[PDB]
Design a protein around this ligand. Structure first.
Ligand SMILES: CCCCCCCCCCCCCCCCCC(=O)SCCNC(=O)CCNC(=O)[C@H](O)C(C)(C)COP(=O)(O)OP(=O)(O)OC[C@H]1O[C@@H](n2cnc3c(N)ncnc32)[C@H](O)[C@@H]1OP(=O)(O)O
Ligand SMILES: CCCCCCCCCCCCCCCCCC(=O)SCCNC(=O)CCNC(=O)[C@H](O)C(C)(C)COP(=O)(O)OP(=O)(O)OC[C@H]1O[C@@H](n2cnc3c(N)ncnc32)[C@H](O)[C@@H]1OP(=O)(O)O
Ligand SMILES: Cc1cc2nc3c(=O)[nH]c(=O)nc-3n(C[C@H](O)[C@H](O)[C@H](O)COP(=O)(O)OP(=O)(O)OC[C@H]3O[C@@H](n4cnc5c(N)ncnc54)[C@H](O)[C@@H]3O)c2cc1C
Ligand SMILES: Cc1cc2nc3c(=O)[nH]c(=O)nc-3n(C[C@H](O)[C@H](O)[C@H](O)COP(=O)(O)OP(=O)(O)OC[C@H]3O[C@@H](n4cnc5c(N)ncnc54)[C@H](O)[C@@H]3O)c2cc1C
Ligand SMILES: [Mg+2]
Ligand SMILES: [Mg+2]
Lengths: 611, 607
């Protein structure tokens, strides 16, 4: 049982952010984007949203109810037929090449538009996008490769090969540097990779593709320890003719298990055995240099952006499903007539707690969309210059700062607020007939893969703030302050934002203080760890509230100018969301600041036996 | 062993060292049950739960029940039926049952502690085993003749259902349209379709099922006050001997496909739609259906909250066991050194934060449902609290929506932390936490949604009650606060009590102001759930602080070994909860004080 047409898209909100808030249309028709105009970008969003609501979403239930089957003798996976049909619709429209470099066959576009297009695939059937990331990986291989490797990357992108990122081992998940997979140099300059990797997404994909590029982290014999000792290797499923791309003999890299998961069931998550079956796993050193963790983080950065966007896309369709249900479900009387047991029955959108729930879902779904689109505006130097006036170096540091927010805050928030979406359906929300319970199961992984929330929060504080000397964080804070410092119709929202900004500044000062104290009392560093996730989530709430308030300011201007009809309703909802978020979400940061200011190490000193 | 990890030590700590329930064991109703026998019963059912009950937890979810339209029956997986037989063969479906129906008299606090284990190990197993408890409720509401039937049903172990919901009547029970038509012989013919009925068929577990059905007699008035309650058995039977006779006209017509709790068959139930009457008997031969059914709803709400709490507890203990053995990363004090020794993940601050959050909420929630249960027996409430029967009943009624609403919501939320502790392995069906999450999502929905719990709590259990039960509990918190080692915790509790008092006053003002400005009432609705949750957090903090005060006493008296570790953990949990959970209530109070109707005035099309 399940909903075929489950996916409800929101192109209108995407276009509002892209063009009316962030002004991405400034760069369309100019420089890198000379051949792409605003009308064409809008048509592309409508087209992929239609394909996503149709053929891609059509197999969302099927992939979960009839999941992939592993044959351990052939080391291959069979995917359900309807899901492969969805994949073919993706390929036939070129949607595995969104934002691929022109020289690899893509259409040049700003990253903000690229991720808005991808949002639709991730909301309709996110595993379909994951299987379709091969050309994107080919582009990363190209950028990191030798001249000869760039030839192979060009073939792979043209032919649409699939791809995997192969880091994790049973003893090396968060601690990538603990990996033991080894690389043995051959006299001809190739390497033989030996080891067993775990949890590898898409490591086999039935007959979707002619080949799969495994990008594998391994430790050359005699290399040093930790991440710094790791190198990155191109390990193709099949050998091939490096001149023509013609597929050759099977390379020694074999799936040996497929996990049984809570959700994302149609994404084959695989134990991957390299050189264990009497056939060498030949690998080629990427770029013919030993620089593996740096190279692989080109991939990780994109995966983390995808995972946060996936969480956000899923909350959005969860909200729209809940809203559509609530508009039609009649239950109970209006609260003003509660005592009159003869009173007319009302649709549940008339109930305060349902409106509370729906506005909570709305404000977070729309605030998160704003966050990932804002982040993407720093991923092209030309867009960052045109829309923000920031140079390429600062833009890169701002993007790096925001990625743990997209991934960590996005994943955690989306899963939490889908609870409200399900609750809106009542008992029916617990049924597989409706898609919210699968959204919940499919999104639980988003706080775990591509680096757990705790790893995101440690990255955010230690690398993206401390190692950055606070430059990116100071830039964003300065933009929030400028908004606050400027019609008095958003006065209370600006005051609530000023309090939230000062709360987050207070948190940052407190955690920085603990870090400095650790120069003298090493254990003081634990308090940074204790507060790190709460700090990451606070910055996300602050950014959400600020971006919603910017959206409200645009909406006020459009209403003042004379918006009517569905436009008017849209703008009215932005004002209501920004106000609701400021009044109901932001004040909690004040208590969180005080909690962070009072952290102590009692919980660290407690005997493990006492838990 | 199995997936289910029990915590009899914490139950006994609460029952005996905190609340003093052993004070009533050996006296009056409980003349024949002593403290040692109570502890042995808890250990024994915990072992049953960890063993044969938990054994089919996975099987029930992976090989769920099948509806057969050829016979209008449901088939259950064989391994789950084996677990059910283990429950029946030890008499555990008679826990809390009246002595005249074959039970062992015991405090409700002990009853729910026993039930917690079955709810942790395989909650649908307890649901199918609720028949005797329902027979006792029928007994209590029945005529003298119906008491005879209820006695038979209890003795023979028949199953039971509570049959309220319809497609257009879930939260709004009073909108139900199922009809009851009186026959010349005084029976009734029940006609209608009910939805989402738990255990409406149960394969060959039982020889009969008692359906307790709400229906509206021809000519009755509208709403819940027009409803009556009917005894509608799956099979007719001899009212004297119990011998099973002809099939009655009450048939399951579908089984829902659910996120979790899959082995609980959740059925569309058709009454008098298959060409044979669904014969019902009016309960008590009086028309008083919603009041009668609330005897059942109260028990169901207590069960659902205890279920959620039981599940968080085994989630936590599974996560803890995993974390103690998982090696990953270096100690944070050696971050810079990429050669540092690897540590188990309990050494990482975020994992300790997560584990203490799970622990504090799991143990606070346990305290809350056991505290609640100490007001469910007049004799216990008198002995341990010094409160009379009338106030005990009102305090129990005040706390039930906390157990249900705050328990269900908190448990599901904090299981997120349990699963996170496992890392990527938590997303695997190899470990039980993802099933705990799926199975516990329903707890915020059936037996009344959280919103309905919060509206019950405020409108009925506070306003209609004139605040008497709420003032009693607040007075006990105040006394604890006013009473050295717990001075910081008492100060934080004082802030939280004042915060909850302010929320209650704001919401009351919004309600009373509705006399002159009708829309004012919407602000009560907007704040109701946050208020319910805030009270739950306050009660958690207070009860944890009371546990910490006992632990300090026991440590000063010379506790050693595993006792000492246990008491140290209680001190740590109370302190952590006071410092990291209670302060948020200050911001929630300010938010509630600032509620406005903008979100109610917004056009629906703007969402
Ligand atoms: C749009 C198209 C895109 C297409 C992409 C292609 C897709 C291919 C197919 C895959 C698609 C399927 C989707 C799968 C999604 C799930 C993916 C996974 O889980 S996969 C598994 C996911 N697994 C994880 O995500 C691992 C989670 N664990 C961590 O992230 C750890 O913190 C750790 C491993 C970094 C610690 O190791 P430790 O040694 O203490 O680390 P240190 O702090 O000392 O840094 C050392 C060096 O690392 C560097 N570098 C470090 N940080 C960053 C950064 N933020 N940022 C950048 N670079 C960073 C840096 O070089 C640094 O050197 P330096 O510049 O300082 O000199
Ligand atoms: C341990 C042994 C246990 C054995 C148990 C055996 C169980 C056998 C079956 C086993 C399977 C069942 C387990 C499965 C768990 C899920 C079961 C369900 O969902 S089932 C479906 C669960 N469905 C639900 O839970 C329905 C959710 N909906 C509600 O609760 C609504 O608020 C409503 C229907 C009450 C509103 O109707 P509205 O007419 O506006 O209400 P008003 O405010 O105007 O009150 C009218 C009358 O109702 C009365 N009464 C009311 N409240 C209480 C109370 N707290 N308290 C007491 N009584 C209460 C009261 O008589 C009052 O009259 P008065 O005293 O004032 O004169
Ligand atoms: C569905 C799925 C798909 C995946 N896809 C891929 C893939 O395609 N390629 C790939 O290489 N990997 C992939 N992974 C692996 C995934 O990235 C890891 O599961 C993740 O990094 C966590 O590692 P772990 O499971 O070993 O958990 P652990 O690292 O053992 O973490 C367990 C717990 O300890 C905490 N913890 C660990 N270290 C620290 C620390 N230093 N400080 C604080 N807390 C800490 C974690 O936050 C977590 O709560 C996938 C995993 C899943 C579940
Ligand atoms: C697994 C399962 C088993 C069940 N078992 C049984 C059983 O054995 N017997 C039985 O009789 N029923 C049973 N139920 C029915 C269950 O109690 C109802 O689903 C529940 O009461 C909610 O009703 P509903 O599904 O019609 O949701 P709705 O009442 O339609 O609620 C939808 C949404 O509106 C909100 N809402 C509704 N009215 C109000 C209001 N006045 N004010 C504010 N918000 C409001 C709800 O909170 C929810 O968010 C079961 C349900 C499930 C899911
Ligand atoms: Mg700027
Ligand atoms: Mg007392």
């Amino acid at each position: 049982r399940g909903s075929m047409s489950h996916y409800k898209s929101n192109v209108r909100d995407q276009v509002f952010n892209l063009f009316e808030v962030f002004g991405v249309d400034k760069v369309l028709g100019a420089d890198k984007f000379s051949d792409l105009d605003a009308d064409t970008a809008r048509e592309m969003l409508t087209e992929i949203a239609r394909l996503a609501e149709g053929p891609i979403a059509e197999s969302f239930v099927e992939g979960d109810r009839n999941p992939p089957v592993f044959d351990p003798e052939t080391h291959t996976v069979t995917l359900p037929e309807g899901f492969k049909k969805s994949m073919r619709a993706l390929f036939d429209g070129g949607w595995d090449k969104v934002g691929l470099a022109e020289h690899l066959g893509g259409i040049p576009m700003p990253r903000a538009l690229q991720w808005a297009l991808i949002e639709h695939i991730l909301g309709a059937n996110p595993a379909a996008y994951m299987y379709a990331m091969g050309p994107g990986m080919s582009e990363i291989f190209y950028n990191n490769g030798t001249d000869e490797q760039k030839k192979w990357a060009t073939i792979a992108a043209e032919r649409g090969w699939g791809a995997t990122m192969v880091l994790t081992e049973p003893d090396a998940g968060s601690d990538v540097g603990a990996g033991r997979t080894k690389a043995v140099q051959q006299p001809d300059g190739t390497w033989h990779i030996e080891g067993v990797k775990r949890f590898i997404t898409s490591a086999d994909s039935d007959d979707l593709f002619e080949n799969i590029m495994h990008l594998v982290l391994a430790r050359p014999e005699g290399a040093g320890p930790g991440t710094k000792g790791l190198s990155l290797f191109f390990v193709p499923k099949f050998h091939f003719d490096h001149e023509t791309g013609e597929i050759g003999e099977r390379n020694g890299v074999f799936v040996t298990n497929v996990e049984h998961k809570m959700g994302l069931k149609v994404s084959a998550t695989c134990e991957l055995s390299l050189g264990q079956h009497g056939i060498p796993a030949v690998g080629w050193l990427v770029g013919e240099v030993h620089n593996g963790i740096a190279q692989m983080f080109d991939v990780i950065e994109q995966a983390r952006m995808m995972v946060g966007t996936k969480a956000i896309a899923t909350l959005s369709t969860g909200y729209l499903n809940a809203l559509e249900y609530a508009k039609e479900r009649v239950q109970g009387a209006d609260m003003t007539q509660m005592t009159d047991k003869t009173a007319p029955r009302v649709t549940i959108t008339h109930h305060p707690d349902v409106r509370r729930s729906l506005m909570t879902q709305k404000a977070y779904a729309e605030g998160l969309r704003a966050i990932y689109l804002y982040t993407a505006t720093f991923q092209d130097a030309e867009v960052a210059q045109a829309v923000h006036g920031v140079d390429g170096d600062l833009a890169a540091r701002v993007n790096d700062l925001l990625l743990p927010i997209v991934k960590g805050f996005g994943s955690e928030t989306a899963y939490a607020k889908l609870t409200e979406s399900l609750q809106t359906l009542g008992g029916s929300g617990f049924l597989q007939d409706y898609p919210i319970e699968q959204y919940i199961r499919d999104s639980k992984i988003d706080s775990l893969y591509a680096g757990t929330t705790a790893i995101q929060a440690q990255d955010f504080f230690f690398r993206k703030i401390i190692r950055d000397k606070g430059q990116a964080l100071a830039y964003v804070a300065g933009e929030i302050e400028q908004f606050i410092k400027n019609n008095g119709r958003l006065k209370t929202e600006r005051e609530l934002l000023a309090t939230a900004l000062a709360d987050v500044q207070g948190m940052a000062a407190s955690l920085t203080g603990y870090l400095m104290a650790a120069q003298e009392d090493a254990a003081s560093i634990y308090k940074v760890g204790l507060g790190s996730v709460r700090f990451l989530m606070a910055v996300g709430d602050l950014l959400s509230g600020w971006l919603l308030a910017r959206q409200a300011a645009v909406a006020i201007e459009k209403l003042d100018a004379g918006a009517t009809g569905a436009d008017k309703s849209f703008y009215e909802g932005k004002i209501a969301a920004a106000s609701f978020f400021a009044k109901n979400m932001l004040p909690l940061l004040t208590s969180t600041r005080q909690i962070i200011e009072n952290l102590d190490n009692d919980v660290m000193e407690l005997d493990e036996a006492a838990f």
